[PDB]
Amino acid sequence: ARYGATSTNPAKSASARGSYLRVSFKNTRETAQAINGWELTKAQKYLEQVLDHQRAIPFRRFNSSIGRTAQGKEFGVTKARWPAKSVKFVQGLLQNAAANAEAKGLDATKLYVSHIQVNQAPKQRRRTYRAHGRINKYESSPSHIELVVTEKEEAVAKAAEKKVVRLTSRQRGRIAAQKRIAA
């Protein structure tokens, strides 16, 4: 393994990845961020809808000259899309992560997606023909996807330092009399 930076409890987490996937790296970036942090079950129901064109994926970085859509008011964005091939690869991983948590014995109900990172796989050169007998690259830009699921947990309690208070002769003198005087 050796995923990217996580902070989660591996004892309470499960994980999955797919490398060298041939999907748009930009598109699936946007859909991975769309789900990052989510309740795992809300995420599944959500990508599902996306495929119905019922809600959309908000495009937030890779997005200039994308179209506008009311389906992104949900998220405060005007540009949003419905990148099918991304969703379907990404739910593939999510379903795999699910399994592994079943297998580990984690509670399927506390499962949120706690790490979801895509970056860029090696490219795929293919070429095309331009005017006056020229060639040009015509490339696939594929993706590694990796995600982690965790059982949610409440609270955190307290516990920290103690603040080592230091205060001079005339600074501890005032306090002495702040009670020798009063309460």
Partner RNA sequence: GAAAUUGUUGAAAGGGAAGGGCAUUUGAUCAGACA
Partner RNA sequence: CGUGGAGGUCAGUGACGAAGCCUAGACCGUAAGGUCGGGUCGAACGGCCUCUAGUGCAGAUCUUGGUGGUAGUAGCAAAUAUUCAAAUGAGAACUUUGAAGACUGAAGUGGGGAAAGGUUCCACGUCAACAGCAGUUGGACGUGGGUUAGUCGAUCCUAAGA
Partner RNA sequence: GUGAACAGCCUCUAGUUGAUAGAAUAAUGUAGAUAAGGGAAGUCGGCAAAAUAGAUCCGUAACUUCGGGAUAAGGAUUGGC
Q: Which residues bind Mg ion (CB under 5 A)?
A: 19, 24, 65, 67, 77-78, 129, 133, 144, 177
Nearer to RNA, 126 or 179 (CB): 126
Q: Which is nearer to Mg ion, 127 or 152 (CB)?
A: 127
84 binds, among RNA, Mg ion, none (CB under 5 to 8 A by kind): none
Q: Given candidates 36, 49, 78, 100, which one binds RNA under the rule CB under 7 A?
A: 36
Q: How is residue 2 written in tokens?
A: 């050796």
Q: Are 99 and 134 in contact (CB under 8 A)?
A: no
Site for RNA contains 120 (CB under 7 A): yes
Q: Does 64 bind RNA (CB under 7 A)?
A: yes
Dist CA 111 CA 12 (whole Å): 10
> Among 39, 44, 66, 110, which residue interacts with RNA (rule: CB under 7 A)?
66
* Residue 56, Cβ density class (10 Å: 0-12 exposed, 13-18 middle, ≥19 buried): buried
140 binds, among Mg ion, RNA, none (CB under 5 to 8 A by kind): RNA
Verify binding: residue 123, RNA, rule CB under 7 A.
yes
Question: Does 152 sit near RNA (CB under 7 A)?
Answer: no
Q: Can you read off the two tokens belonging to residue 102?
A: 């079943």
The DSSP bridge partners found for residue 148 are: 15, 115
Query: If residue 112 lies in a helix (H) or strand (E), which one and from where to where?
Result: strand 111-120
Work out what residue 120 binds among RNA, Mg ion, none; the CB cut-off runs from 5 to 8 Å by kind.
RNA
Smaller CB distance to RNA: residue 135 or 176? 135
Task: In angstroms, give the least distance from the CB of 167 to RNA.
Answer: 16
Residue 74 has phi, psi (to 5 degrees) of -35, -35
* Selected binder of RNA within 1, 11, 52, 65 (CB under 7 A): 65
Angle, alpha carbons 180-181-183 (nearest 5°): 85
What are the contacts of 77-80 at 24+ separation with CB within 8 A?
80/56
Report how far residue 181's alpha carbon sits from residue 118's, in angstroms, rounded to the nearest whole number. 65
Residue ranges that bind RNA, judged by CB under 7 A: 4-5, 7, 22, 24-27, 29, 32-33, 36-37, 61-66, 115-120, 123-124, 126, 128-129, 138, 140-141
